[PDB]
Design a protein around this ligand. Structure first.
Ligand SMILES: Nc1ncnc2c1ncn2[C@@H]1O[C@H](COP(=O)(O)OP(=O)(O)OP(=O)(O)O)[C@@H](O)[C@H]1O
Length: 165
């Protein structure tokens, strides 16, 4: 069958955690890039120095979106690992200044229990704004927004969170 997970953080990939948030309409919180038009994605982070995923995610979320009214409804039993192209990799190495093939992250489903006013793409006054906009999309739509190298990594999250969406 499908093979796009990881029951353990492999080598080359840096610690990371994803936060899959959904709306009362059963949509998935998708945010557009602040540098790439039409580039949508979900809030994620490379975990904190010696931080547990579930925490880094719940934390990272309030850092990337600042969403305070959100609770976990699901958690992918495995880790999601992806890779970047020779332009992104080669670019990150200089822009980000890191030498990694990708990032293994354990996506966690979060049910929004607040108001659209809580959604702050900037962050909780910690990190700098990464997204410029956001919208609600179905697990199939968000999949259409995601990129080829991030399709499975996402579909996995949704797939695992299907019963919740
Ligand atoms: N949909 C996309 N289309 C084109 N390039 C993309 C897309 N999504 C990501 N990228 C490229 O990949 C880079 C990083 O990929 P990704 O968004 O998966 O990682 P990340 O958000 O940097 O990870 P993190 O912030 O957790 O450390 C982007 O800066 C961009 O160059």
């Amino acid at each position: 069958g499908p093979l796009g997970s990881m029951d353990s953080p492999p080598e080359g990939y840096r610690r990371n955690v994803g936060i899959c948030l959904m709306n009362n309409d059963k949509k998935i919180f998708a945010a557009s890039r602040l540098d790439i038009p039409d580039a949508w994605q979900m809030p994620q982070g490379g975990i904190d120095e010696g931080e547990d995923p579930r925490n880094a995610a719940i934390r990272e979320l309030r850092e990337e979106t600042g969403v305070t009214s959100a609770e976990v409804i699901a958690e992918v039993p495995y880790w999601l690992t992806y890779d970047f192209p020779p332009k992104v990799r080669e670019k990150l190495n200089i822009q980000w200044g890191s030498d990694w093939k990708g990032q293994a992250q354990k996506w966690f489903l979060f049910k929004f229990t607040g108001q659209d006013q809580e959604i702050n793409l900037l962050g909780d006054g910690s990190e700098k704004p990464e997204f410029g906009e956001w919208s609600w999309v179905t697990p199939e739509q968000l999949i259409d927004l995601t990129v080829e190298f991030k399709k499975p990594v996402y579909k996995e999250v949704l797939s695992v969170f299907a019963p919740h969406l």
